[PDB]
């Protein structure tokens, strides 16, 4: 009746002991929660039958969410989430190998426009076309 | 088939509650139509409404919750009721399960402009009665988006 979602999570180049300290696996938006053990794997318990999006939330490195469909009989499967055209199936192996995609990009870099950017000004061209018109 | 709902009005100098029977509403749930059958105002009622209008009082309508388990009621500026030649609309709002939710009364036109009104005007009840079931909100549109993105990809 009640099933468990297993998985793993590894960030390339960084040992788990450095990032698992403040990371939580969420099964369907805090409605179920779990914590990753020392090696990096994670297990979530007390999951009823249905469909749930599993995401490894961690401020250091983001993780791509993965949908998991578990049936009443017991067979259960994983795939890529797609909130549009949900009928599609893109299978992903059940022992979730949710490899991280590096640190996220919360910050946006400064513009720091150069003189070469000033070279082709739309305003300058749109105001110098009348200048050629004014001369002519 | 058809269910009858009482409908009382009230208007006084002190703006208290003196609801008296005005009209019956025959709500036929099958075709979803509502028709009201009220009696026309009398001389004393017309006078009372005149003083209520003079003091900028309120005209309150009230119907029972069920065809005495409760009441749902609302109000409208009675002086605006008399300055609109007794032309108004009461809308009966119900819910999805077919239970009475509320009654909302509003005149036509609203407000007031100081128009003096003769007695002969107040011998007719130009009331437009409508029933408003809950309107289903639209879900997100996915088919159009997927077909459009398929055309974009191709």
């Amino acid at each position: 009746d009640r099933f468990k979602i297993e998985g793993r999570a590894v960030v390339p180049g960084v040992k788990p002991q450095d990032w698992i300290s403040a990371a939580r696996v969420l099964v369907d938006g805090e409605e179920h929660v779990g914590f990753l053990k020392t090696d990096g794997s994670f297990v979530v318990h007390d999951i009823p039958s249905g469909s749930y999006v599993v995401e490894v939330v961690s401020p250091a490195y983001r993780f791509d969410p993965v949908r998991v469909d578990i049936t009443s009989k017991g067979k259960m499967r994983a795939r890529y989430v797609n909130y549009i055209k949900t009928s599609e199936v893109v299978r992903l192996p059940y022992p979730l190998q949710m490899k991280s995609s590096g640190p996220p990009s919360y910050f946006i870099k400064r513009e720091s426009w150069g003189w070469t950017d000033f070279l082709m000004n739309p305003m300058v061209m749109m105001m110098v076309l009348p200048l050629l018109i004014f001369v002519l | 088939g058809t269910v009858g709902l009482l409908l009382e009005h009230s208007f006084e100098i002190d703006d208290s509650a003196n609801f008296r029977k005005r009209g019956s509403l025959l709500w036929n749930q099958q075709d979803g139509t509502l028709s009201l059958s009220q009696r026309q105002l009398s001389e004393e009622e017309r006078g009372r409404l005149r003083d209520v209008a003079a003091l900028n009082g309120l005209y309150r309508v009230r119907i029972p919750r069920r065809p005495a388990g409760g009441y749902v009621s609302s109000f409208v500026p009675a002086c605006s009721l008399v300055e609109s030649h007794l032309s108004d609309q009461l809308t009966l709002h119900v819910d999805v399960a077919g239970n009475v939710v509320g009654v909302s009364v509003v005149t036509h036109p609203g407000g007031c402009r100081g128009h003096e009104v003769e007695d002969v005007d107040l011998e007719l009840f130009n009331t437009s009665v409508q029933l408003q079931p809950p309107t289903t909100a639209p879900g997100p549109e996915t088919a159009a988006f997927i077909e459009r993105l398929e055309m974009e990809q191709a």
Binding site: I20, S21, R24, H32, V33, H45, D46, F107 | -
Partner: protein, 127 residues
Amino acid sequence: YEDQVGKFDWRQQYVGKVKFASLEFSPGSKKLVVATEKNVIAALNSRTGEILWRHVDKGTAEGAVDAMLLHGQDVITVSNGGRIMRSWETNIGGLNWEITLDSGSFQALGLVGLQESVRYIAVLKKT
């Protein structure tokens, strides 16, 4: 964002009222392991009182800490009325094992020893 970290914003980390606490630790470990009424299991630095590793849980009663015990370097917790029992490595700041239990209301938690060393956990439910 704009990479102006700490110029205007400030965050404070708060655990709830300390329902269960554990102070027994190595003198150089300088750690407190505390589980609060807010379903939070956290480690506080002994010297300055700051969060080392914090693991929040479900807001509802379905994740409430019911009993804490400490042994050696890992802290052992029971949550959801005896439904789950977890072992947290206090140094790394992560789980060591998470085991679901059978039904029945948890009533008491304790340890057992074979001859000289503690190696098993005795957990008792109403039945």
